[PDB]
Amino acid sequence: MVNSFSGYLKLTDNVYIKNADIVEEAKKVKPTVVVNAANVYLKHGGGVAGALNKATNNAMQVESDDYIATNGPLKVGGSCVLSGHNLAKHCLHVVGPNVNKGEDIQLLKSAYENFNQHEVLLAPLLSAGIFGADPIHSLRVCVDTVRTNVYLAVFDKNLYDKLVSSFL
Numbered sequence: 001m002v003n004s005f006s007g008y009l010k011l012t013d014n015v016y017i018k019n020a021d022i023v024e025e026a027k028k029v030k031p032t033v034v035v036n037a038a039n040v041y042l043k044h045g046g047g048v049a050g051a052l053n054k055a056t057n058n059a060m061q062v063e064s065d066d067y068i069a070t071n072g073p074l075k076v077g078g079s080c081v082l083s084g085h086n087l088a089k090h091c092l093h094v095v096g097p098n099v100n101k102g103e104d105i106q107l108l109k110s111a112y113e114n115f116n117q118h119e120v121l122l123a124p125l126l127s128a129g130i131f132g133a134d135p136i137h138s139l140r141v142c143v144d145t146v147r148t149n150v151y152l153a154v155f156d157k158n159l160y161d162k163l164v165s166s167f168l
């Protein structure tokens, strides 16, 4: 399919980036898949997760609570596909490593590998916020791992400007 993604800078054959709120991009484009930067408990408190969940009027959290009750926590580096509610067809919840809490940064590659199961994704930079991975590192792992088409929404203007001026 052709989506209405607009205003993205090309990074590579398959990776595109924009200074935008992922919630607003999802609302406008209604992509097949929006990626959440989750924790293993799917407790969507802040950052991307909290903003996505609020935009679903808490439906994402209610669904997530049922998922955990049935299946238990995700693995670090793991994922699950749930509804995208009013934002997207699906939300791919992906758990990057919580580097600030001692988890292995190498698991960020495993996390991004989940994206390869989907032809097109709207996504954030995993682990680059409250989980404490260096943002440029997360971008480089994304570029070096994801082979499907990924549209990265970077909320923070200062960060975007730095990332797009950095080697990959």
Ligand SMILES: Nc1ncnc2c1ncn2[C@@H]1O[C@H](COP(=O)(O)OP(=O)(O)OC[C@H]2O[C@H](O)[C@H](O)[C@@H]2O)[C@@H](O)[C@H]1O
Pocket (backbone or CB within 6 Å): 020, 021, 022, 023, 037, 038, 039, 043, 044, 045, 046, 047, 048, 049, 050, 051, 096, 124, 125, 126, 127, 128, 129, 130, 131, 132, 135, 153, 154, 155, 156
């Ligand atoms: N609305 C947004 N749109 C786009 N990018 C955003 C947005 N909000 C933040 N970012 C950027 O998105 C990037 C990721 O920041 P984070 O969302 O913290 O994800 P993590 O993987 O580091 O931490 C996961 C925890 O975050 C939640 O609390 C979860 O529930 C988890 O517990 C940063 O560059 C942000 O500037």
